[PDB]
């Protein structure tokens, strides 16, 4: 009672009893700043008119799926080195360079598919968008199996960001680039689940 | 029951080893080890937790 | 069709209307 | 409570991050009350490996980092 | 039994050293003035004891969580 | 006069604390709140990695499990 | 009883889990530090005593080798509380 305790289980009963008399939760009112966490940007919206309609977006996504099925037929039938940024750039784009034939993309493993995408993004930041570039990106995207690594998700968002910026330079929809850019943006944004980047018109 | 008062060496998590003689234990796998030596040193009597004891051999 | 991809791409671009 | 919600997710396909960072895509066959998950039609993405198909896989609740859920998933419904 | 040994450390108010689960480069040292069934310990006049560096940081009175405990000794 | 863990904890609310985490980071702030499971809420929170002031986070919930020890500060 | 639970929800409107019930009540965003060594910025749709969480519109943010910010987006998510370290109320973010 008022003694102290002599065995532990007693003490513990003692402490337990005490702890049920305590309030369970306790809020203390106080009387009176923050760092910032950088965060990478969304896509740049499309100039007025340049935005593709939902049915077109859904048309390609569907279409792109089917394409990726085909890609696994060849992939059953089985080049610069994986780390060769320079030779991969040359190989694909050239000066010309090699197109993306199933022959070739079907021989590339995923870690390479990924690398290469990186290289063509680093080329794309500092050079202009050709149609040749266009095919490659689209191919490497058709060779990317999922579920994607986080690192790979970040890559293709970077790439889609880089497309939307370039789309602001354009001055007529007649530009060759516009369709290609809208596509890649749509595929990352809808096929690869990054719908924060999507062009909801 | 019959590791009791029988010398033994323990392997603990984070890669640590311990040599002493089992003196007592409970349902929760906690131990009392007597005359214990840290194998990197005599450190007397010590309470070891249930977990944190990867291996336990004589 | 070893160039199914290059073809698919062009069809897809092209299909913009 | 929230695990009640998980248990309503049979035949939903999801991606799971493991604590080792492995991404695991498959279709839920069942979730138990301690978050242990059985999947089928499974594709496992590894840091320095190619992928792995598997007919089935079951996973301990305490090896999961999180679940990525299908976007179409209707949450407000299932939160009841 | 082990609880008896912890309890004993409470009666004597012994100075003890704790082996941390998650952390091997460091131990905690203090006099024990309370605990509970989760083995959470109120710990008086406490010290972080570094390894290699032979350094000791005064904390004062701290509450140590029970899940962190690999091992308890006396000092 | 044994001081036991919950009462000790309850006794810290309102006041400056240094919570230190099982993974090495620690958090100084005014312990606003506390619950059954020893989750905690801090205000005017400051993060220390390696012991180097890292961030100013304002208000912050800390999950119970991650905590190593908590102590008072002046 | 079972209505005593109700004590649970009062315990949420106050006490450190308020942080989350803020987000659920107001459609506010939180910032969660996770063990994966990444940060999640999203809205809380639901949560329990363990900080298991349903999230919406999550950005997974991290840096990596000088160091480059990386991110990724996640429409809907079930986060195990285990993975949680801290949670910021009213975080501050900038492009």
Numbering used by the authors:
A (entry chain 2): 42 to 73, 79 to 124, 135 to 151, 174 to 279
B (entry chain G): 10 to 49, 55 to 72
C (entry chain M): 35 to 51
D (entry chain A): 2 to 81
E (entry chain E): 16 to 90
F (entry chain F): 3 to 76
G (entry chain B): 13 to 77, 88 to 117
Can you quote the paper on this entry?
After we failed at obtaining a different crystal of the original 7S complex by trying different solution conditions, we reconstituted Complex A, a 7S complex with a short version of SmD1, SmD1s, in which the C-terminus (residues 83–119, which is invisible in the previous 7S complex structure) was truncated, replacing SmD1. In addition, surprisingly, in one 7S complex crystal structure with the full-length Gemin2 (Complex A), we observed that there was no electron density inside the RNA-binding pocket of 5Sm, in contrast to the previous complex structure where Gemin2′s N-tail is inside the RNA-binding pocket. Complex A was crystallized under a condition similar to the previous 7S complex, but has a different crystal packing. So it is only reasonable to explain that Gemin2′s N-tail was located outside and flexible in the crystal of Complex A. These data indicate that Gemin2′s N-tail may not be located firmly in one place; instead its positions may be quite dynamic. Consistent with this was that the peak of 7S (containing the full-length Gemin2) eluted earlier than SMN(26-62)/Gemin2ΔN39/5Sm (7SΔN) in gel filtration chromatography (GFC), indicating that Gemin2′s N-tail flips outside the pocket and increase the complex's size.
The assembly of snRNP cores, in which seven Sm proteins, D1/D2/F/E/G/D3/B, form a ring around the nonameric Sm site of snRNAs, is the early step of spliceosome formation and essential to eukaryotes. SMN binds Gemin2 by its N-terminal Gemin2-binding domain (Ge2BD, residues 26–62).
